């Protein structure tokens, strides 16, 4: 056994949005798997079965708790250099003014190295143990990202972006053939590295930047290598209308992807704000997933995803930060913003209720893992799963949270857990484990 | 002279939402006033006029800047103990379930001391140099808050809350006569202490907790002592309708206050989400102000204040955190949420545009100071004003912000300033000055 921990564990299950396991014992194997999880009353029994001494057990402080690692289902690693600025002009203006020039710089491998090192370190330290990254159109810089994530021990999908259409910034695109060849090369080189927890993902940027021909070939590569696919869908009203006019023969945005083999049981689509009920039924039937990106949706004045309607349709859904469209790199920010979007829908009388903080906590961990096809391996504390987890200390040095005796003995349930979700930050994250290995501190 | 600083200063003016003054020299007197502000080319001249040596000048790091202190126009100091929890059930449910029991504990002076010490230290360290506090109905605990704020050197209005109606938690109220006598005592004792920058403010909680009789007498006390008034107005639809049914003889919520001498040129009202155009004209004509509390308005599913409409009506407006209805104690959070509310109005097509980050920055500093009647003394860097300011270091130890060479030499304007406003936190606030005195570090 690599670790045995005693203390409080907080996670989600499909039948319980937030389950708090107090004074429990958890064991993690050498291979990084959770091998037991039981009440501490079972110490003697476990110590015999698993051959360990009581002195080998790490006891958490009385006010600390473990929770599962946060899962970021959509982030543009390549836009991190300007995250927290701009976020004003509209989205085609924006893409042209900020985004495409920033991504064009990734033709320089040394620039790539600086930005990607910073983004992987920053998200890990904020407790993002699994990330689904968009990189750039450049195969070699996108391979460097994969190598960086492996070095740091973060779990990740890395996607070389494809685009053969780009009218507003023509310096930043590939020919159709180039896009196909470079994707084939990216995937082969990724498979050659054989990284234990970093895999390639097929990434048409979106339907407006990829021809039918390209889309269809990317779909074939995904099928033949059995890979995940990631793209954007129905993020704003102008995009919805642009697609309608560039692809008039398709019934809706969803059909454009579906008929081109881009909507599979291993597909995740960012945004989804303007998907209709009919389109959600198609997501459900195909096993495709949505990455809810609430900060970006408000920051860029895009729209509101109706998460309650998505859940009613039994569509798989996780949370994403959508850096740099969303200005925050934090999944704690994404959780807060998700609660707020659901409240917006209640205020506007679209829905009759809002999402609870606990339901959103489940989206950020188990929901996200399900959205990326990883919920057999991660997302909560179940025997069999990889130990992807973060040790939270609400009383850490310089903590942004003020705890009072009432938070432990008063009349508000999960008071401390809720204050961490609403007020905490990286100062409260003392340790981060991915695959049972301690990755933070670095 | 107490200080002379050389470097970058960022502030608002009425004609410019964000003015960046690079390599400037600023002098602060012994009395805490700004005595000069000029380009550093004037060093020799100023050194002679004001009798100081070049070695006496404090040079800011090349990546640091001063900005004015943040002004929190509305916060319930007494609810800080449960901030970051709860925030789920509706507002009368909430008031009954969480708020009134928490405020009832302030009958214990030792409890008051702990909560109020923590809140004043926390807001100061987050750069809130001026705060307009609601305390509790207890005169002695509310006087302790005033004393605490004085000890720490924060500028503040402190308001003993009045309520003689409380059907849902009758243990927490005063009789009408008691309310009047205790307000008179609070004000007298505040004036006896003679604090240099902490003043009393008359505080009927809101029309639903104060009888006509009470409201009218509070209005007389304000008039006769020439005091500010603070209350809540038109925060949610149910409140609007409750007022209509408890005060059927008044034309609208605004009239209830106005006809009872509670709407004056020294009045600030929190929320205002459901004020009509006619009511805003009355605010404008009386000189009364609004405290925009966007985090609380979304957190409690209340509504959206249309800030563009408020500005179009030339109504005075600042920002507030509304702890604990809003879960964050940070004015940086309030700035971010304000931008987001204006974007909500653009997405819903109520407005044709949103507020810029710069306009919201102006609300958080100069707008707020104007809302509290203090814009002759604070809110920006102008000769004559008190030096209320915060030194920002975006590269501080453990900074949440990653700076890149491009933020200083690229094509995005005020990149660094914007990253601090969107991503910064208390780690970026190195020093806080109120009245020219350094109050942080403590
Ligand atoms: C007129 C329309 C075509 C509209 N202005 C438009 O082009 O929408 C673009 C955004 O669609 C998805 N998308 C593609 N790349 C990105 C991207 O990099 N970030 C985000 N948030 N969305 C993206
Ligand atoms: C049915 C209605 C009367 C409705 N449920 C209601 O009572 O609204 C109450 C909120 O009005 C203003 N208010 C009074 N005290 C507070 C308070 O402590 N926090 C906030 N955010 N608002 C407050
Ligand atoms: Zn995106
Ligand atoms: Zn309030």
Numbering used by the authors:
A (entry chain A), B (entry chain A): 9 to 450
From the paper:
Interactions were detected between GDA and valaciclovir, aciclovir, penciclovir, ganciclovir, thioguanine and mercaptopurine. UPP1 and GDA bind nucleoside and nucleobase, respectively. This is probably one reason why we were able to identify interactions with these two enzymes, since our NAL consists of both nucleosides and nucleobase analogs. Few cross reactivities were observed between the 23 enzymes investigated within the nucleotide pathway and the 45 FDA-approved NAs.
In the present study we have addressed the possible cross-reactivity of NAs with enzymes of human nucleotide metabolism using an in vitro approach. We have designed a nucleoside analog library (NAL) containing 45 FDA (U.S. Food and Drug Administration)-approved nucleoside drugs. This library was screened against 23 selected enzymes in human nucleotide metabolism using a light scattering-based TSA. Thermal shift assay (TSA) was used, where binding is detected by the thermal stabilization of proteins due to interaction with the ligand. However, unexpected stabilizing ligands were identified for two proteins: guanine deaminase (GDA) and uridine phosphorylase 1 (UPP1), which were further analyzed by using biochemical and structural means.
